[model samples]
Target: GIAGKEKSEEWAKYYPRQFDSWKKTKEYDSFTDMLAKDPALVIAWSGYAFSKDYNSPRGHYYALQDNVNSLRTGAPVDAKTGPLPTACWTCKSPDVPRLIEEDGELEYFTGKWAKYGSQIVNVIGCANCHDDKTAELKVRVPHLNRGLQAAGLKTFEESTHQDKRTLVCAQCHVEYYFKKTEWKDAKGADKTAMVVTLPWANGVGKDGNAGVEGMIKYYDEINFSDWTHNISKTPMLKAQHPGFEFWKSGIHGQKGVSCADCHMPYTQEGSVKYSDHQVKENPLDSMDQSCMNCHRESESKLRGIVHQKYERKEFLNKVAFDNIGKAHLETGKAIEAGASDEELKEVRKLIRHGQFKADMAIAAHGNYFHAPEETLRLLAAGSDDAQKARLLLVKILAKHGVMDYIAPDFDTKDKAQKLAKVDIAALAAEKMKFKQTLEQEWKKEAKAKGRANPELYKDVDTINDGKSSWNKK
Candidate 1:
């Protein structure tokens, strides 16, 4: 079966057209530096490694490569010492499903990011969503199974084909977290594993997924905080892309438009019809194939429609960004200005809530197109909480006899990173050393094992300088 054949190229002879288009996931890929585009993120993500280097993801082909290079995982010389867990690899490769099938979810979720460096070398591919022998689409992620149960949603076997289209993407696209659990290893050792989990108990606005409010309640119940801001000292929730969660609340989801209908549109290839595997992140890029069937508008008119929505999204985004950035900066100042924990508790909570609200929308890269109304509202609420937090900080600062608080300059990415105290040079040095040393060895190991795409691991000496106006340091 093709599932056993981890390499995608093995199927190329059988599906030449699909293989050709899918390969473009690399050639067509573009990197956008999210941090450089919005420097305010530097302040918001302070105390987190994300502030060091957060780039926008463009395609599926580089999943393993990108994860290997990101500073967020830290420079791990060995498997035992890293900031992130092996659960981080849960979404990066189809090897994850293979491993899960062989060893189960507990084995896949236990350990550090570097632990599986050689094992999970395949990038995301056909195995992620399709059955090998049957050619039927299937959900392989066991995390999705548990999430469905929690949300009271239909299991994969229970879902219809139309629903399966979206559900497959949800395996990785949805907001998920590491649920720490105690498990017994095969050797009978007791260990704690960071299990991958989805917050969907309340239902996904509809179709048996938790709504945004329900998720907030769920997080509240668990008292989970992904990280604490080093400067603000506020316990914050880091949002993974919540595209699946937010999209369900939008018009497209309510009206019954599956993600595949837009992303993997039907196409004709010399009399043979098949779903295009190229998969446009921006459906606007392939409007003829992706959108023309429903919206009988000129390309220019459709462009206008998107821009109109973007106007609302970016405006609200900027508002939330400014207030949240200011709130974090202010919180830092308040802590230094003799504001006691007792006095700043509510302010910290407000700031935390505000950041989460904004992040919930911002993390979903295509939120404006997916659901403008809900996204804009999230930003608006986030800004509200941030401003409120700021007001409280003002009063607290005044009480401590410091009314005139001048903010620091952070107009550029460099400036914001400095203010946020991210040591870029140090982080880069470590990552480069790891890239050239241990990861170089990993490439050899993966190559020997036939688990990796060799092209991705070619650049050994330099940093992964991102594209799109962002240059190498």
Candidate 2:
């Protein structure tokens, strides 16, 4: 469970500022910024804990702070316990592995998130990846090892350097959960046991070719979903940042290029060389160093290839986008126009299909650029199907004497709310009330226990300025 702790002291000196900023950002600003973006998101996520108060991740630094501020875990009033289960803190802090080991997995996951909030004050850090004692990269999560075992592969010890590169990303970026088992405890009670697991058992890919479709099917067959949608009422599966998984499916992955190959490319200053850990977008803005590694071609020519791919993907996505928006608007209008229930149902279904097309377009991300012909062809098929769906909706609307109906007012955020027939202002007020009540209760409880509030942090405080040639404010 531990990675070697022999400190890379030389590397530490080279990156002092970056480490500080990453540490400091483990505070409230990360969560606050996300809420300030669009208060309406609260309504969008009404049923989910996310709706209560969601936050954007500030890298791994603020994972813990963001979770605690979230209203999803209603404040606990009693001294005996808190709001959420211990599992809620798993991804946010390294302490989870220790707690799970000591308490038994089921007992750990049996509580609410808020119940464990105080105990999870520390955010994600090197401790979650490198062993605190040995400082060698290690796997604390047993599920990862089990995933390998299920696939008939030896544990992490048997993995190659290339495999280790990918596995490091798997540590945090992968999706997982605790499953319930009907097992008896010492009391002879039917105790529910929880086992943390990942679904990468058969590996990733189509037909076990190791890609997205295969992963999707694996979850679908098992009927797995993070939560069900509140409005669409569909069982919803949350996608973790599958950048690593998706990249693995791309030509780069097939060519055995890891994320570190691109994001954290190696650099040398005088006699020392190290992997840059600033993990960011490509430095192709100054292609001299970036593209030089992979392509000897002129910067402009390489950029041109990237642009061409982007354009196709953008064009196809736009087509799907317009069709989906129109389908949803048309269905809404048809329902308002007193269309028959059967007719309305058909239009709604079409709208859903159109949405699916749009989603697939987005999910396939940059596909048109990566594999233009196949990507464009698929987008074309999607456009045709979406149009067919919209055509049915239009006909149904016409039958209801809505042929010349004006599109719903979608301008001005307020007007758009009215057009959608949702009580936006009221919903906002309701969310605010819910959030205030929960936060106040939690703070009061914190005071009673003499718990210190989380500290606010800035970007410059944590990140090392030297690694990135990136322009930063």
Candidate 3:
């Protein structure tokens, strides 16, 4: 009677092959520093938590650890109150669904992140995409379930098998915002909470975010901004990955090719075939592992096509990065010259729109392949809008008797962060001290629940004697 549960280990015994493949997600080639690699990001996301410390991503297995350990989310840690809302953990853990079911989504999302810190012990897992009894693909997040309908879909059950493949990933990979609602509780006391929401008011389709312009319109009408740009004083929208929308605009999405088709391609073990759940970048190492299913191109030819696509995306991305980052600095200079809110209004609006266009694609590199053409178009528009902002700012600055305005050098991440006034050294060091004690408490609480510490990979967990730690135990 106690055997069946929401945990992955409970079902993992019956699905050994799948569990093994999922575990492989823990291994990564290396970690990267996206902000340090692209300093313009430091300028663009100046006032945001992301600017403080943004690191490269790992596999699905490391979701909780990565999110919890990030300087952006956990610097000045407090168990009951933290800088971020609990909603930040929404996509990082499968334990979220259980908490939402037990305490209700509204209440679950109302508090600070650390208030529920010790409650989570699991990373992304089974219940994230399946029913406990039925074991069929399903939407675990209620917001996403409603989000599908907001985008003009019927119930999840009405979705085609092909669409469900992508929909499962959309539960997290899609773009959304924390909607702040103010109302009276049942007892009539005032209360407020951040409700996770998707902006699909204009509609959604192969056009992507109802054609990008649609999302912009929705955000504009609502007057929403994730944060104000510290340099320019313009309100800005921070795009969390919008992979699903970009994918929908892609040829593969239009052709009805599921994300699983490429990412989780079928593999045979002896006579039994199952979808490989390693969930990694395709074109395995150097050969075509997933592309050949649709394209009959040779391995080199396939890599050639993918390479050209990335090269194009990278080129345009840098162009937008250069243009938009400079635009923000220019606008900041104009404001410094005493340009009125009414005077700098249009310049600020253009800066806001321009950055969102660039950030949407930048936040999700999958957009490069998901919709290469669409991705390029968005970056191009971002670059153009940024230049347009600069053009308008020139007149405003000159009108204020300020003709010689030179933007400062921000060629490095540190320089850009300093320009933004981020004392990263202090923030990171503060987190380091708190992190050790916080995680220990989390593990202790998890142990109290019989969850114990991190799962030991039988052979992977061991001491090495001058041997490669990666080698089998």
Candidate 4:
């Protein structure tokens, strides 16, 4: 039986404790509802679609559904149109590679997000990481291949098996920026693909300075900004999740530990030994297999190590997160006080750099566990940059002869959105209206196209029958 068909029973057999732990936990709600209730987020992402709706990632299971419900995609009434580009679906579905293959990578990337809505109904699954014919691990996403080449590294075909496995996740997990101008193929061939490329021009890994600072420098050199902040008028860059980049600079990565080694540890079931597929945070139920293999410590001591590092990371994260929010608000004040572009130039730069640093620190899901010391360095740097930006804002305001204290209400999410000139209530109401109609239409279209057919994988066996099978034993 395939895990998807057998459902909870199949998952329980492999990850008995995690299956129950995941069900009881409210992490999904934390990601989905946090943005609407948090004022700092609205202020931080004032000019972006994220300000409309930002949700926590709920792993592979909710990828497609979450995007469908998210206000970030806007509300498309039919299956043929949506506000986002087709490139937005790159990381959300296994169908992306198929669509790209059918319509040419460049054409698929350039189309609207909804153009293939009925065609891309499946969630992330086997096809994403495996070749359909041989079931061997393979890189399906083209951008990952192009990114490695652009960074002057070996293409996926040239990489070792270990690197290829890690690069599979790097396809979406790393920080990337969409090219502003038309992108060219590796041979400098003319093309108009609005491709997502890793900012690896400066280089990556522990030896290279390709962390948060390096990425900001690369973007600055290219004169690329995701958007100009509506409040501060700063050309800001948003940090996407950079887990792979952070891990590459960490002790585990330097010592030859791959993501699969930790997240997909080998498990024994009678005589059969295989790596588990339910990728998630290790719940210590299998600490003997995952952690104890490396650190000969007792379970309690191992848990304490992770817990302590997380506590410290959270403390410093608050320091940097709060300061970045303050910087955004302060820059808004400076702008309102008639601070000249010349006076506010450095102030804007500081805000841009500071926010990116802080965002990078928090964006990576498990950075504290992956690299505690490096995470602290990023948080501290962000705090320092934010403080410096605030200081510059003070001088800029004074130079403009504006003596009155400029403060925006930070009392509540409502007040914060008001300060940012965002009508949250109106936006939410419109989104609800769209949600009521769009989801049903998507389902209808998907069903009509046989996309919702659960029987499609009924014949495929993801799990071999409960028997060991080395040479058909």
Query: lDDT scores for all predictions?
Result: 0.81, 0.51, 0.77, 0.69
The predicted structure with the larger TM-score, 1 or 2, is 1
* Candidate 4 Cα RMSD after full superposition onto the native fold (Å): 8.5
Q: Which predicted model would earn the best lDDT?
A: 1
Model 3 agreement with the true structure over 10-128: per-residue lDDT tens digits: 76767789888887876652446777788888899988888877765567876776677677775535666568888888997778888898777777888788877777667788778
Return whichever of 2 and 4 wins on TM-score: 4
Candidate 4 residue 377 C-alpha distance from true site, Å:
1.0
Which of candidates 3 and 4 reaches a greater lDDT?
Answer: 3
Worst 10 residues of 4 by lDDT: 463-472
TM-score winner between candidates 1 and 4: 1
Which candidate, 1 or 2, would have the higher lDDT against the true structure? Answer: 1
How high a TM-score does candidate 3 get? 0.93
* Model 3: worst 10 consecutive residues (lDDT sum): 463-472
Question: What's the TM-score of every candidate structure?
Answer: 0.95, 0.65, 0.93, 0.84
Number of backbone collisions per candidate: 5, 30, 0, 1
lDDT of 4 by residue, 56-100 (tens): 565465566567666677766664566777778888777788777
lDDT of 2 by residue, 1-473 (tens): 22211112223444554354334333323222332343333322324554444444454554554455344544454433444555667776666665667666666666555555444444565555565556566677676777667545567768777766667666555545456656765567666544656666666422213333444566667766556434333344444443434444557666776655654566676675765555433445646654578778888888888888878777776676455445555655666677665665554444333333334334433344333443455456556655776788778778888776555433333443343344534544443454456545654564456442332333422222332111113
Q: TM-score-based ranking, best first?
A: 1, 3, 4, 2
> Candidate 4 — which pairs collide?
31-56
